[PDB]
Design a protein around this ligand. Structure first.
Ligand SMILES: CCCCCCCCCCCCO[C@@H]1O[C@H](CO)[C@@H](O[C@H]2O[C@H](CO)[C@@H](O)[C@H](O)[C@H]2O)[C@H](O)[C@H]1O
Ligand SMILES: CCCCCCCCCCCCO[C@@H]1O[C@H](CO)[C@@H](O[C@H]2O[C@H](CO)[C@@H](O)[C@H](O)[C@H]2O)[C@H](O)[C@H]1O
Ligand SMILES: CCCCCCCCCCCCO[C@@H]1O[C@H](CO)[C@@H](O[C@H]2O[C@H](CO)[C@@H](O)[C@H](O)[C@H]2O)[C@H](O)[C@H]1O
Lengths: 194, 146, 751, 49, 48, 49
């Protein structure tokens, strides 16, 4: 069987094909995604709500519980868990079946959460509820630091929030910038109840 | 035909959300729902009391609590719909003659229910920031909802 | 600041852009503010890229060396020199088209593919050169050799696709990894085949010297400089070839004894398959540890910050440690906030850096655990990081015991501790631990509702006083540099640190009288949970555990399931939730993937040989390479992790290729009127040289990954000795057994 | 203008193609969507209050 | 709409919180808010 | 419709450091006057009042 005949006689034709193969390969090399692992962790949506001062049981039953009632039964939902903490935060993680589109899932979960939203206490509604696709892939961690204690944690977080975070968030494939640390600046009024 | 059900639902949801503040307050409080119709009926399963021991509202609540979400998590099941009596509510059936006897309006009793049936954010003792070597962070519990 | 990338993003492009942006922004930092790149895991993929690139060059050089030694023409070596890079580099374009990516798995796929692509080039150029050594001209010998192999080339491509592409269709996490390995190898295999039919023969027709036409510029010097070596290697190679021919004749005479040994060895393959402990994705030093601090329940965050600072300082004095990334208040359960817990991520110095033997990630962690054991204000444990961020347990379970019947937090906690209490009996299960805590100290406040309303005090006034003073209501926003910032009022620090500070708070009655809550409320001590976790809309308590890695998960999960059915009280059921719940959903495709792939390879071979029995001569050989590999891992007492499994798969592919060419050669010799015996011997002798060429190329590639002490040579040698034994077995079993199978199947073909 | 010459002479090859067709069909048989009708009712969205 | 409100008041109490929330949407090219003296507030978010 | 004199640019002077609307106009007018003193640009107009 001479499938090789045409090229044995035409080495330039054969070289031209392999150089085309090579050129396409180099182009794709410079267009491919680079990452440590593939998308292996099933996608999830995250709902966040504060209820400051409320006991984790109050948050669990008067904040988290209605939201789960609305979220429960969303299409392609693998499972869901809410977590209420004594610092007043409530966080629901709705995990979807691997291969779900994260964006469609977040839109479904956002609709459900809106249906439930008037069921929440006024204070939880006023602080606001957020629903976002989790970006499980950690690229790197950047810290702002005060190496001579000139400035404190809330200052550093505020700086990050004002000048740093959005520049990073605009880069290209950066899906999320998450700040981990002290709280942002606020006007505090500290009553002497006496 | 052939429009994508999910994007269509999303578009109608955006529009209904725009309309929401034009609605009366009460419709807002009970809530709006916007959902894609799943026209393909696979099967219908009934909960039943074969000797009338438990009534329609009990049966619907049981479906809601134990059955509906499991069935809805079966693969390819797009929607489980309950058809029957209403879900549970705490009903207070006012005697308007009696309510007037104590010289009260129905408005007054409704305000009492709002006043006395409400969760409490009871606070946290020893939470941050605190000055001395305050040893514990204690959250507060207090019965608010009946 | 944790920067998280989108799907299909470029870790390297992002990391470089972040570092450039940070360097630009630091130019505006007020004095006393700085940045630090604390953890940049993209460096890992970067090393993997270097790993491939370097391994490719090594491999190309090696094949050139092998060709120069065996074919003793420098011109023959250009055939792999161009064919291999063209195949490997070309793979990226089809990899893009199918929406894959450069990840560590796919790069490893490429390094394994290098072997298959190199074998392809060796097969084509050795065949052409062999025909030339039979006195033909370059053009004519290229024609003949390509007529000899072009059919088998297409069939082996199809067989390799039939082995590997089914793997990409598995389910779950295993499937998602194999998808990368197999797609990369399959693409490379198809591309290399195409090059094997067009570019390799054309190159060898235009570059191989026929009889006559010698010396040109470099051939003369090469013969001058290496003639003694050439002559000696040819002498020993000649000797080995005739002794091998004798050995094939011996085994072909005692074919029945050979079959007996083969049945024994198939048994040994099953035994070693079950003796080597299973694995999934091995432990990699990810350049940090996680130390957890849990103080006594309900402790204040100031107590925790002191414990966390101590841990950090201790770590900073520990060698190999680069930094202490501390979070007082960060809980391992959910990365949420707790008063009594905190985390220090201890980043380690680079692996090539002063990490030495005793200064390794496991060693550093053990030392830190010992030193932290002398922090008595808290329980501290430092743990190794997850190999893949996002899944954890790695051969263990976690499940959720759910209160479905309003059984209360207390009775659910009693149920879960009873479950742990029955399960630590002895079902091979391990240290099942929970995180469900309902004995953090709390305060219960009792409001006498009637008494409040008699005092003229509204119950909403009592609660509002409690919230604003003790829980800090958010009032409205104020503007600062055009941005909104939240005014929040709250009782001041001194006025809320202490239980009866509740009692000193005053509301007002309808009359205008300040009623203190000392007169309408009682404050009592109590216990509760700090974090309520509600799983599947049920208040739930997690328990996680498992067996040792040389035990699987299904038997352990059967044990917990039975124990729970025995132990859980009324209204308290349980569910699985993670890798285990996802596996339980999976129908274990494998039970259809492997049968489908063997059936597919059988059919492909059947079409190529036009025989229903000759495919067996190939298929029956593949268990032996498994054995060769598994005994190798067994001889190093490693595990059968997915990396070593994809290695096993490439080894079965390579052994299949060698067998396919041996059998096809014997078939054509028999069609030239040779008896099966002499056809088998002549084919085996004909194919001996290229098989040796590939085997020797791999084994010389394995030699540097064995002599690499002091460096990052744990996984280098770990797959090194495995590949040595896999190669030895692939060659030995192929050359000593495929002739035997051919004659057996061939004299069990009719009558 | 006829391909079947090649396959008349190599019946095992013809069988291999047909058995592969058969196997593809069996795999697909166990992956297909099943219902009484196709999607013929136009999709609609429903809002409740 | 914020009828009667000054453009600076609209820009700072209406536009600014809305844009702080909008900020960071995926594939957002940039955004501009515009407050007019007739009480109208208009944000344009341009995407990739 | 949607191009805005493509043979031209548009740019944004941003008050990032809490300067006044008045001081912001001052910066823009200094920029316009200095861009007239560099002989490479054309006429620069604004709508900022
Ligand atoms: C012949 C065998 C070859 C095996 C090939 C292995 C895969 C090679 C992947 C090629 C890289 C493709 O991805 C490309 O990576 C480079 C660095 O390499 C990134 O480059 C980024 O980091 C480097 C760091 O030195 C910077 O200098 C560069 O300016 C920056 O953009 C590109 O932004 C990205 O487009
Ligand atoms: C994933 C699904 C794939 C389905 C398809 C599988 C098909 C596999 C194709 C393998 C290639 C078969 O290709 C076939 O090779 C054989 C070699 O044995 C050739 O046949 C050869 O043997 C005969 C013996 O009579 C010699 O006389 C002849 O000179 C030689 O060409 C055929 O002319 C060629 O057509
Ligand atoms: C170039 C050659 C390429 C080779 C290609 C090989 C492809 C092999 C595909 C294997 C598919 C595995 O994928 C899996 O298939 C099986 C087959 O029924 C399905 O499994 C189903 O089968 C049974 C059959 O009784 C059903 O009753 C059951 O509900 C379900 O388990 C899964 O829902 C699907 O995920």
């Amino acid at each position: 069987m001479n499938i090789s005949k045409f090229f044995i006689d035409r080495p330039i034709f054969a070289g031209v094909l392999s150089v085309i193969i090579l050129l396409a390969g180099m182009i794709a090399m410079f267009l491919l995604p680079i990452s440590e692992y593939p998308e292996v962790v099933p996608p999830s949506v995250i709902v966040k709500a504060q209820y400051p001062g409320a006991n984790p049981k109050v948050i669990a039953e008067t904040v988290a519980s209605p939201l789960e009632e609305q979220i429960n039964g969303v299409e392609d939902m693998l499972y869901m868990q809410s977590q209420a903490n004594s610092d007043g935060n409530m966080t629901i993680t709705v995990t979807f079946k691997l291969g779900t589109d994260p964006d469609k899932a977040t839109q479904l979960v956002q609709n459900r959460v809106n249906q439930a939203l008037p069921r929440l206490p006024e204070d939880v509604q006023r602080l606001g509820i957020t629903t976002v696709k989790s970006s499980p892939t950690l690229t790197m961690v950047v810290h702002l630091i005060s190496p001579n204690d000139s400035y404190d944690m809330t200052y550093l977080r505020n700086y990050a929030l004002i000048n740093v975070k959005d520049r990073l968030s605009r880069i290209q494939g950066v899906g999320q910038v998450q700040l981990w640390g002290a709280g942002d600046y606020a006007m505090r009024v500290w009553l002497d109840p006496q | 035909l052939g429009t994508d059900p999910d994007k269509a639902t999303q578009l109608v949801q955006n529009r209904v959300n725009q309309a929401l503040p034009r609605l009366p307050e009460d419709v807002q409080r009970l809530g709006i729902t916007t959902v894609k119709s799943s026209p393909t009926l696979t099967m219908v399963v009934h909960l039943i009391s074969p000797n009338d021991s438990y009534d329609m509202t009990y049966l619907r609540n049981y479906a809601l609590i134990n059955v509906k979400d499991r069935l809805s998590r079966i693969q390819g099941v797009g929607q489980v719909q309950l058809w029957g009596a209403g879900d549970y509510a705490m009903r207070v059936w006012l005697d308007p003659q009696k309510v007037a006897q104590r010289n009260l309006t129905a408005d007054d009793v409704v305000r009492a229910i709002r006043e006395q049936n409400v969760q409490v954010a009871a606070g946290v003792i020893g939470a941050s920031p605190t000055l001395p070597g305050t040893p514990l962070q204690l959250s507060v519990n207090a019965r608010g909802r009946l | 600041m944790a920067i998280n990338q989108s799907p299909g993003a470029n870790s390297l492009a992002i990391s470089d852009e972040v570092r450039k942006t940070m360097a630009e922004l630091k130019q505006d930092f007020p004095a006393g503010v700085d940045y630090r790149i604390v953890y940049d895991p993209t460096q890992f993929v970067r090393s993997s890229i270097k790993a491939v690139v370097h391994t490719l060059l090594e491999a190309i050089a090696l094949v050139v060396i092998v060709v120069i030694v065996f074919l003793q023409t420098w011109r023959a070596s250009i055939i792999p020199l161009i064919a291999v890079p063209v195949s490997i580099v070309g793979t990226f374009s089809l990899l893009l088209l199918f929406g894959y990516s450069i990840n560590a798995l796919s790069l490893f796929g490429m390094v394994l593919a290098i072997g298959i692509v190199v074998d392809d080039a060796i097969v084509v150029v050795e065949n052409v050169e062999r025909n030339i050594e039979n006195g033909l001209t370059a053009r004519a010998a290229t024609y003949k050799a390509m007529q000899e192999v072009s059919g088998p080339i297409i069939a082996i491509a199809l067989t390799l696709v039939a082995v590997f592409v089914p793997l990409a269709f598995m389910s779950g996490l295993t499937g998602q990894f194999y998808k990368q390995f197999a797609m990369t190898i399959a693409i490379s295999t198809v591309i290399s085949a195409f090059n094997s039919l067009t570019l390799s023969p054309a190159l060898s027709a235009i570059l191989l010297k026929g009889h006559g036409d010698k010396e040109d510029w470099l051939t003369r010097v090469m013969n001058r400089v290496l003639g003694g070596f050439f002559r000696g290697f040819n002498k020993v190679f000649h000797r080995g070839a005739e002794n091998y021919g004798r050995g094939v004749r011996g085994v072909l005479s005692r074919k029945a004894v050979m079959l007996g040994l083969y049945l024994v060895l198939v048994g040994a393959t099953l035994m070693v398959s079950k003796i080597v402990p299973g694995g999934f994705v091995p432990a990699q030093d990810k350049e940090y540890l996680i130390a957890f601090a849990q103080l006594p329940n309900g402790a204040s965050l100031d107590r925790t910050e002191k414990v966390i600072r101590d841990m950090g300082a201790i770590a900073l004095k520990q060698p190999g440690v680069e930094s202490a990334v501390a979070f007082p208040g960060l809980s391992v359960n959910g990365f949420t906030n707790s008063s009594s817990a905190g985390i220090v991520f201890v980043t380690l110095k680079p692996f090539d850096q002063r990490h030495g033997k005793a200064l390794s990630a496991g060693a550093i962690a053990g030392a830190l655990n010992q030193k932290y054991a002398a922090l008595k204000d808290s329980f501290v444990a430092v743990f190794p990081p997850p190999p893949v961020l996002g899944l954890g347990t790695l051969g263990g379970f976690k499940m959720q015991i759910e209160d479905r019947g309003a059984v209360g937090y207390a009775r659910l906690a009693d149920a879960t501790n009873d479950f742990i209490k029955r399960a630590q009996q002895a079902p091979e299960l391990g240290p099942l631990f929970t995180s469900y805590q309902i004995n953090v100290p709390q305060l219960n406040v009792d409001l006498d509702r009637v008494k409040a309303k008699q005092l003229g005090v509204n119950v909403t006034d009592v609660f509002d006083t409690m919230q604003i003073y003790l829980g800090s209501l958010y009032v409205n926003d104020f503007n600062r540099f055009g941005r909104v910032y939240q005014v929040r009022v709250q009782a001041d620090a001194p006025f809320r640190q202490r239980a009866d500070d509740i009692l000193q708070l005053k509301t007002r009655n309808a009359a205008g009288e300040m009623v203190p809550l000392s007169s309408l409320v009682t404050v009592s001590p109590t216990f509760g949970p700090e974090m309520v976790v509600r799983y599947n809309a049920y208040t739930a308590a997690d328990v996680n555990g498992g067996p040792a890695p040389g035990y699987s998960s299904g038997q352990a999960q059967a044990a917990v399931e039975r124990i729970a059915a025995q132990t859980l009280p009324r209204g308290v059921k349980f569910e699985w939730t993670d890798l285990t719940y996802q596996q339980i959903l999976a129908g274990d495709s494998a039970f259809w993937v492997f049968p489908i792939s063997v059936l597919l390879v059988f059919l492909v071979l059947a079409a190529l040989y036009e025989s229903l029995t000759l495919p067996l001569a190939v298929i029956l050989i593949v268990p032996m390479s498994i054995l060769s590999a598994l005994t190798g891992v067994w001889l190093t007492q490693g595990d059968n992790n997915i990396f070593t499994q994809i290695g096993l798969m490439v080894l079965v592919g390579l052994s299949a290729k060698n067998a396919i060419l041996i059998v096809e050669f014997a078939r054509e010799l028999e069609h030239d009127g040779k008896t099966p015996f002499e056809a088998a011997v002549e084919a085996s002798r004909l194919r001996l040289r290229p098989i040796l060429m590939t085997s020797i190329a791999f084994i010389m590639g394995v030699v540097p990954l064995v002599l690499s002490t002091g460096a990052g040579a744990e996984m280098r040698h770990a797959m090194g000795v495995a590949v040595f034994f896999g190669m030895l077995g692939v060659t030995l079993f192929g050359l000593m057994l495929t002739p035997v199978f051919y004659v057996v199947l061939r004299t069990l073909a009719g009558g």
